[PDB]
Amino acid sequence: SMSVKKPKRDDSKDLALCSMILTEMETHEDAWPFLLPVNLKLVPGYKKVIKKPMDFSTIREKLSSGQYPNLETFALDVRLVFDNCETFNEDDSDIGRAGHNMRKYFEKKWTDTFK
Numbered sequence: 001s002m003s004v005k006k007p008k009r010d011d012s013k014d015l016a017l018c019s020m021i022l023t024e025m026e027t028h029e030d031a032w033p034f035l036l037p038v039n040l041k042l043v044p045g046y047k048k049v050i051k052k053p054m055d056f057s058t059i060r061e062k063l064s065s066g067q068y069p070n071l072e073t074f075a076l077d078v079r080l081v082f083d084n085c086e087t088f089n090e091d092d093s094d095i096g097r098a099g100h101n102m103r104k105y106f107e108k109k110w111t112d113t114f115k
Contacts, residue, residue: 014071018063021109025078026056028105030098034081050088054080071114078106 025031037055040047059077061067068074085099 011071015063015068017113018068018071018074021106021113022056022060022063022078024109025102025106026060028102030101031056033085033095033098034102046088050084052080052084054084056081075110079103082106 026035034056036057038046038050038053040053046053054077059074059081062077063074068077082099082103085095089096089099091097091100
């Protein structure tokens with residue numbers, strides 16, 4: 001509350017560390033469904049169904065241009081990528097499997113870097 005603060009957690013490396021995680025997600029062999037925005041002209045149903053499209057290249061541009069206020073807003077966009085994937089793709093599909101794999105990969109790196 002006013003003039004009452006928990007001890008200050010060092011957040012000065014968070015930007016660099018989120019960048020590193022994102023590089024690791026970009027270079028994973030199962031990243032290919034997620035590297036670029038879904039083409040809304042060429043994928044019927046996407047535009048109407050997926051209210052907030054998100055992809056690694058959009059996260060990278062937001063990250064590089066100071067559009068994440070803190071590391072939690074960064075995590076919320078990464079998770080959005082996978083939540084969108086689960087919304088639109090059957091679990092038993094190459095893309096559906098890719099999303100589950102990448103979400104696992106991300107959640108481990110997140111825990112190990114920050115928790």
